Design a protein around this ligand. Structure first.
Ligand SMILES: [Zn+2]
Ligand SMILES: [Zn+2]
Ligand SMILES: [Zn+2]
Ligand SMILES: [Zn+2]
Lengths: 50, 49, 66, 50, 121, 1117, 116
């Protein structure tokens, strides 16, 4: 269903980007659904304590 | 005690001098220092004293 | 908490004077005449009794049993 | 860098009169640490040392 | 640093300072108002200045003296720079440097009522 | 008759009576009591009835609260020991009326439905300890000196720190530089205890025809021009507007200033296009015009200026209030009125444990109403008559409060990171002055890492409210603050009696005003609602004051401010206004006369009290905004005597000036003889001085406790530390200090202690560490149990000696234990894995007591605490009350210390160089007067501003006992016996021993445990970590050019590792070294492989790059 | 001088100034109404760039009963002749020069204010 495939790829794009950058502008921050934001690979090395 | 008397006399004179500078400002007799506002002149005078 | 056994500074036994101290205060000796009457001359011994706070009397309000 | 500011309306403390620019009225501690500070100049000293 | 003899006398160092310190009309102006004095010679504010110079409305701008003198300025250059700055739409009948009040009268000749406030502002 | 000086005695019979009536934590207790007695019922009462196919109405009534009970009454010490939450069930009467077709409604009242447990603050009006005698408190194993004012959450004492905020309902005009606005009239509005949070308004003026006034209404994205807003309130005419904004048209200047805002709006006249304008700026604008109007109509009715009123009050009363916001903006623009200082403490309020909890209860309640609504919907709407008693998820309140008081996240757990943090901190039991000051602690929410100095500066308005000295010198410096001794935070009272009284006395109500009257008439502001004007404000101020002085119509906490210059009377009754009592001055005499002092001296014997001083119009609670308008003498004999008059118009007099100090600062003697940062450092260290922290410490299982063996009462005290109860729970020893350089081991901020004094118990302390462990059903096959492991069955099992603990699986009191000894033997079945708990590494103490019990889950739970006698040693940090601090640098036996003519050796020798840069002359005067006190044989007074004391008077006394009048003595060198040529300043000074002992700090590593992710040393002593060789050390070794030691530190001594890499690419190859075979998948090469000595964190970095699709191809070429 | 806003008599809106291009005279017309009233002041607008304002116009007599405020006996009133007078600096922010002292007669039903 070409309708839903668009949303499927949009959500895959969200997960893959959030794997390497959780802090997208505007996009919902990926989380462990109990609150805590997901430390992306960027965040593993981004700043101090990288 | 003579040293304390000298210190106290000095402070008294300084307090009196600040009172006189205030009087000069209150009466508008305090001419501003160039560049300074009258307030900045007064504050500079008091800080110097 | 309890009275120190020896004056920390010099060594004089002050641990047998606290109840005497308080009894002399209860005779309404003035606070330094109690110390003069116990025999504490050095201000190092006097600050053992003057400064002592006898908290063990409060600790003994708590019951282990009865 | 300035004298004690008028944090009350036109005065430094309620003990002083409005527009008291006099020395002690603005933070001049005139005692010494052996003489001890007056309570007003103790507060001004605290403001300064902060 | 001052290169010429001006380096010594505070007087001829002062004019360098005036030639450097940015000085717009707001610094030397005192009181700026408007008036629909229906003729140049109508002189509703009672002035003899236009009568020797012989819009139904004008800007009047009484300037400051102790601020204009301290800059060694004159109405001459002020009016020149006005007319040059806005072009000959504006005419400025400035006062003379003998009167007590340092008025400029400014008119336009060829949405106008607010326009004097627009150019003054 | 009047007090003829001799006034110090009277002055401390007052104050003494205050602290009898209002113990130090009264501001917590009263806040909580008011929350439980009013605010809780208010919230449940003012929540609307819930309704919905037929629809019920569901409604709540008369909320009830029992005593705290475990299900039988839990004592707070039991809740503390069993890790329970000390709490009481909250019950409410619920009337359900379902009504349906055929007109058949049944109003069945579910009486006393259990809504949830609410946690009780200790010693409140609802704690079991309330009014309870000292005998009974000791019988409860409670401490009669313990203040209360904290919660027990799962056994932890949790204090609610009072959170500072901008005052609601009050207009403030600020200039915000770096913005398009020249001025901004802010308001933050709350009508009463609303579940809706405070709504904020701004009426800004654009700086840039110029000078256009905007308004930033809430729920509006754009910024409607104000004149549109007034037209939306229905005022067509430019003269009905401005009548609200310019109270006399006779002022041309405001008129010609406001004109350009009218020129921004003259395109709009009728209210309906104005509402279309506002609705079209809505954050959720409706498609049809009518919905846009209705949205904007609601916003103005309910969201703008709610404190002024809602519905009918919209089109007038708060039109006037918005007019006043504009008027004061215009004053701030003409400069007729100064800008409001955001950090003036009259502009602030303090959210105590009442409002802090009311906010949550409005958040956890309403949630419960949503829950029961959804339940009854699901049921009733399916024609399934619900039961509400199953609908009420009591978990919502009980766990919501429990959670927020535990974490301190002041909001839902769903959204805690969005909430405030650390509102609720574990009570500091370290020492009693720390407990008392933690309970009296205020906190600015201003961001730390906020670089602004102005919110950290000691503002002039904190006088008498907040300690000028007690602040954390850390990053929180000036943000965290402390109440002053007599400072009282107003708990809040209803304005309705005041409004009814103001309806008398010829007051003119705001909606009956002819606006021309406002020009020459004082405007009255009850809780920041403008409510009317008055022709004669010299009668109101005298009458409202008289009524406060009579306690009848106006409660003492109400503050009436008369702004003379601007004709405004502002009356605040709300809660969180910090205030302090002041003696009233009338003519020039005090009202406090010898009658009051005599009556109050026989107090209890006559049951007179401080409340009688208040209710006799003798003392008055003034608050920082009313303090703006008092003229405040500082003592009568100083300031009201017939000198050449300073003012002669004092309205009030300071009760005693030392009452500006807080709890830890008022233990400093002679603080007026110290440099102010040193009084701050003492206010810090005084929260670390070991003492006896509470007298029931033998029952506490606190995780960390330090108890001094022989804590002493100070030989010199402030009078204030009477009420701090410092002479009952003191923290320190008066020691014969000598200020001499001697052997030099005391040199840079260090002390030489007497070893023989230590041998006698000088500052000897005990350290109790409590270890808590409980049981659990981990799963079907997994279960923990207290049991001695045995190598036969327990598979996992440490190298430890498990036989020290007996077959219960619990070490017994009186057993010597050392680091990595087993304390609670514990097995978890897989046979059994070892899961036991070991004494912290290098702790080495004796088991003091072992307690065993059941937790909430009904699992066996034990807490073991181990004591550790800490004989002072080199490196232990001592300090004095004057911010002198220093490690013990060496200990000399009595034979080696210098000695006077008599054999008085010092106990502590501190280097002279501590003094001259720091000017802690209060330290020298303490030592001198302590030497007087110890000879004189009674405790000297060091109350700061006491002009009865001075150095010369002390020296005169000291010379009478046969000592040098300046405290110097000839000492003899202990080593050689020669007289020291300089006579040494020696005398009793009160030293403290701080929690910072060196054995708690010494740490070493040589290949200990390693992190799992990056194979570097673990972090911290407790983990047996390795010290961070940081960036700056890297730089310092580059500067050294010490590349070999830089390589070893940043590699070979941290994460030595190796990778094999392909020679053709630089992706790490696969290397089965175990068979010495190597390949790179992708080139299929097996010879082209080379080993690379490689930091593990570098390997890990490159694999974190490859997982981003980056090939950091390392090449040997 | 100045010019105030004169409001329309019909709509009570603000009257704008407009020249009579026929009779050559200043009018004050309305935007919403058709109300033409004949000007007298011949002025549109003024602007005191000096920011010269007399503070005695802004000083209100009620300040005398302020206990917070210094009292002199060194300058008597002029209308009545009271000895008592409170004095203060110009509270207005436009005061960088004006440390000048403004005095108010401390006597009810007088409120005479002056500057020395
Ligand atoms: Zn001794
Ligand atoms: Zn390869
Ligand atoms: Zn009209
Ligand atoms: Zn008069």
């Amino acid at each position: 269903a070409a309708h839903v495939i668009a949303e499927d790829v949009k959500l895959l794009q969200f997960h893959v980007a959030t794997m390497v950058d959780n802090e997208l502008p505007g996009l919902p921050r990926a989380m462990q659904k109990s609150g805590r934001p997901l430390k992306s690979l960027k965040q593993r090395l981004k700043g101090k304590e990288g | 005690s003579k040293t304390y008397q000298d210190i106290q006399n000095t402070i008294k004179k300084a307090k009196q001098d600040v009172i006189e500078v205030i009087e000069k400002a209150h009466n508008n007799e305090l001419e501003p220092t160039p560049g300074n506002t009258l307030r900045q002149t007064f504050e500079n005078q008091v800080n110097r004293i | 908490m309890i009275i120190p056994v020896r004056c920390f500074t010099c060594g004089k036994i002050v641990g047998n004077k606290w109840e005497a101290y308080l009894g002399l205060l209860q005779a309404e000796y003035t606070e330094g005449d109690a110390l003069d009457a116990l025999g504490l001359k050095r201000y190092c011994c006097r600050r053992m009794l003057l400064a002592h706070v006898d908290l063990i009397e409060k600790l003994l309000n708590y019951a282990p049993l009865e | 860098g300035k004298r004690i500011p008028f944090g009350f309306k036109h005065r430094t403390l309620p003990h002083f009169i409005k527009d008291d620019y006099g020395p002690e009225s603005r933070g001049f501690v005139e005692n010494s640490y052996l003489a001890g500070l007056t309570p007003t100049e103790f507060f001004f000293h605290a403001m300064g040392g902060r | 640093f001052l290169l010429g003899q001006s380096a010594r006398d505070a007087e001829r160092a002062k004019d360098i300072l005036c030639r450097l310190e940015h000085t717009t009309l707001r610094k030397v102006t005192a009181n700026t108002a408007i008036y629909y004095d229906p003729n140049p010679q109508s002189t509703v504010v009672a002035e003899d200045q236009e009568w020797v110079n012989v819009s139904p409305w004008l800007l009047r701008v009484e300037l400051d003296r102790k601020h204009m003198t301290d800059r060694k300025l004159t109405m001459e250059q002020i009016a020149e720079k006005i007319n040059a700055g806005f072009g000959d739409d504006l005419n400025c009948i400035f006062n003379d440097d003998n009167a007590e009040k340092l008025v400029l009268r400014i008119r336009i000749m060829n949405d106008d009522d607010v326009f004097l406030r627009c150019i003054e502002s | 008759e009047i007090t003829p000086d001799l006034w110090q005695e009277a002055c401390w019979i007052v104050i003494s009576s205050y602290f009898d009536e209002k113990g130090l934590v009264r501001q917590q207790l009263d806040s909580f009591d008011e929350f439980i007695q009013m605010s809780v019922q208010r919230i449940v009462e003012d929540a609307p009835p819930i309704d919905l196919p037929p629809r019920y109405l569901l409604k709540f009534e008369q909320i009830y609260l029992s005593k705290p009970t475990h299900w039988s009454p839990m004592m707070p010490n039991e809740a503390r020991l069993r890790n329970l939450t000390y709490s009481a069930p909250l019950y409410v009467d619920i009337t359900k009326t379902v009504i349906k077709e055929g007109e058949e409604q049944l109003q069945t009242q579910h009486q006393k439905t259990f809504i949830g447990k609410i946690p009780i603050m200790l010693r409140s009006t609802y704690c079991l300890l309330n009014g309870l005698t000292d005998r009974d408190l000791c019988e409860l194993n409670e401490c009669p000196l313990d203040p209360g004012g904290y919660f027990i959450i799962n056994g932890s004492e949790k204090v609610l720190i009072a959170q500072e905020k901008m005052a609601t309902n009050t207009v403030y005009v600020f200039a915000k530089k770096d913005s398009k606005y020249a001025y901004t009239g802010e308001c933050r509005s709350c009508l009463e205890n609303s579940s809706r949070p405070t709504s904020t308004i701004w009426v800004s003026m654009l700086a840039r025809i110029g000078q256009r006034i905007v308004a930033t209404l809430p729920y509006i994205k754009q910024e409607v021009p104000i004149i549109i807003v007034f037209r939306a309130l229905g005022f067509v005419s430019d003269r009905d507007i401005l009548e609200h904004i310019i109270y006399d048209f006779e002022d041309p200047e405001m008129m010609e200033m406001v004109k350009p805002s009218l020129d921004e709006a003259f395109v709009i006249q009728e209210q309906n296009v104005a509402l279309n304008f506002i609705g079209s700026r809505g954050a959720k604008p409706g498609v049809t015009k009518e919905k846009r109007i209705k949205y904007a109509k609601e916003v103005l009715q309910k969201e703008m200026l709610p404190h002024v009123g809602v519905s009918d009050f919209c089109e007038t009363k708060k039109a006037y209030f918005l007019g006043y916001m504009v008027h004061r903006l215009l004053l701030a623009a003409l400069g007729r009125r100064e800008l409001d200082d955001r950090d003036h403490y009259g502009n602030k309020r303090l959210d105590l444990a009442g409002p802090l909890l009311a906010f949550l209860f409005r958040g956890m309640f309403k949630n419960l109403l949503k829950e029961v609504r959804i339940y009854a919907q699901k049921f009733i709407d399916r024609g399934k008559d619900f039961n509400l008693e199953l609908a009420i998820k009591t978990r919502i309140i009980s766990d919501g409060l429990k959670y927020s008081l535990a974490t301190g996240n002041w909001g839902d757990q769903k959204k805690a990171h969005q909430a405030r943090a650390g509102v609720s901190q574990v009570l500091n039991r370290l020492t009693f002055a720390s407990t008392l000051s933690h309970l009296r602690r205020l906190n600015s929410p201003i961001g730390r890492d906020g670089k602004l100095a102005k919110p950290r500066q000691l503002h002039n308005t904190l006088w008498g409210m907040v300690c000028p000295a007690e602040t954390p010198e850390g990053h929180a410096v000036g943000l965290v603050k402390n109440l002053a001794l007599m400072a009282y935070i107003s708990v809040g009272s209803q304005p309705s009696p005041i409004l009814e009284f103001l309806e008398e006395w010829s007051m003119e109500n705001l909606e009956e005003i002819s606006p021309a009257a406002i020009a020459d008439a004082t405007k009255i502001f009850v809780n920041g609602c403008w409510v009317g004007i008055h022709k004669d404000p010299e009668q109101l101020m005298n009458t409202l004051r008289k009524l406060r002085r009579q306690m009848d119509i106006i409660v003492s906490e109400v503050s009436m401010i008369r702004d003379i210059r601007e004709r405004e009377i502002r009356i605040y009754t709300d809660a969180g206004r910090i205030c302090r009592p002041l003696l009233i001055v009338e003519k020039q005499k005090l009202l406090l006369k010898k009658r009051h002092i005599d009556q109050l001296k026989e107090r209890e014997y006559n049951n007179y009290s401080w409340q009688d001083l208040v209710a006799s119009g003798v003392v008055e609670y003034i608050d920082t905004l009313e303090e703006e308008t008092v003229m405040l003498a500082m003592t009568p004999d100083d300031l009201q005597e017939k000198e050449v008059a300073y003012c002669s118009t004092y309205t009030h007099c300071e009760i005693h000036p030392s009452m500006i100090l807080g709890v830890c600062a008022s233990i400093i003697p002679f603080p007026d003889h110290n440099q102010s940062p040193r009084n701050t450092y003492q206010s810090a260290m005084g929260k670390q001085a070991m003492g006896v922290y509470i007298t029931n410490f033998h029952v506490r299982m606190d995780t960390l406790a330090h108890v001094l063996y022989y804590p002493q009462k100070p030989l010199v005290t402030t009078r204030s530390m009477e009420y701090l109860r410092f002479r009952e729970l003191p923290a320190g020893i008066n020691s014969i200090v000598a200020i001499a350089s001697y052997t030099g081991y005391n040199q840079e901020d260090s002390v030489i202690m007497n070893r023989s004094a230590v041998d006698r118990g000088f500052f000897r302390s005990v350290f109790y560490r409590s270890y808590k462990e409980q049981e659990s059903k981990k799963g079907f096959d997994q279960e923990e149990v207290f049991e001695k492991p045995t190598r036969e069955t327990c598979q996992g099992m440490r190298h430890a000696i498990y036989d020290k603990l007996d077959d219960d699986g619990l070490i017994a009191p009186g057993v010597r234990v050392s680091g990595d000894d087993v304390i609670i033997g514990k097995t978890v079945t897989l046979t059994k894995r070892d899961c036991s708990t070991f004494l912290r590494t290098s702790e080495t103490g004796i088991v003091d007591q072992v307690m065993v019990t059941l937790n909430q889950e009904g699992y066996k739970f034990c807490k073991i605490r181990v004591r550790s006698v800490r004989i002072p040693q080199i490196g232990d940090k001592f300090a004095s009350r004057h911010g002198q601090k220093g490690t013990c640098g060496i200990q000399y036996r009595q034979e080696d210390m210098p000695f006077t003519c008599e054999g008085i050796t010092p106990d502590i020798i501190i280097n002279p160089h501590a003094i001259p840069s720091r000017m802690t002359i209060g330290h020298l005067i303490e030592c001198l007067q302590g030497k007087v006190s110890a000879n004189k044989g009674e405790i000297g007074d060091a109350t700061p501003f006491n002009d009865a004391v001075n150095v010369q008077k002390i020296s005169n006394l000291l010379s009478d006992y046969g000592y040098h009048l300046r405290g110097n003595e000839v000492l003899y060198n202990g080593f050689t016996g020669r007289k020291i040529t300089s006579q040494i300043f020696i005398g009793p000074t009160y030293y403290q021993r701080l929690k910072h002992m060196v054995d708690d700090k010494i740490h070493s590593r040589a290949r200990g445990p390693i992190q799992i992710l990056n194979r570097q040393p673990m972090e911290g002593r407790s983990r047996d970590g390795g010290l961070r060789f940081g960036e700056m050390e890297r730089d310092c070794q580059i500067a050294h050019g010490a590349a070999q030691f830089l390589r070893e530190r940043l590699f070979e001594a941290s994460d030595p590792y190796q990778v094999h890499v392909c020679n053709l690419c630089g992706i790490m190859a696969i290397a089965n070294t175990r068979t010495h075979t190597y390949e790179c998948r992708g080139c299929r090469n097996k010879t082209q492989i080379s080993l690379v000595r490689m930091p593990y964190a570098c390997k890990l970095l490159f694999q974190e790059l490859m997982s981003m699709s980056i090939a950091p191809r390392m090449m040997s070429v | 001088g100045f010019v105030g806003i004169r409001f329309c008599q019909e709509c009570n809106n603000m009257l704008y100034p407009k020249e009579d291009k026929e009779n050559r005279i200043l009018l004050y017309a309305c935007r919403n109404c058709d109300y033409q009233q004949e000007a007298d002041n011949s002025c549109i607008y003024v602007n005191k760039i000096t920011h010269e304002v007399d503070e005695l116009t802004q000083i209100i007599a009620d300040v005398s009963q302020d206990p917070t405020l210094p009292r002199t006996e060194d300058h008597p009133c002029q209308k009545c002749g009271h000895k008592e007078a409170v004095f203060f600096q110009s509270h207005s922010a436009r005061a960088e020069d004006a440390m000048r002292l403004y005095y108010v007669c401390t006597a009810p039903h007088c409120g005479h204010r002056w500057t020395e």
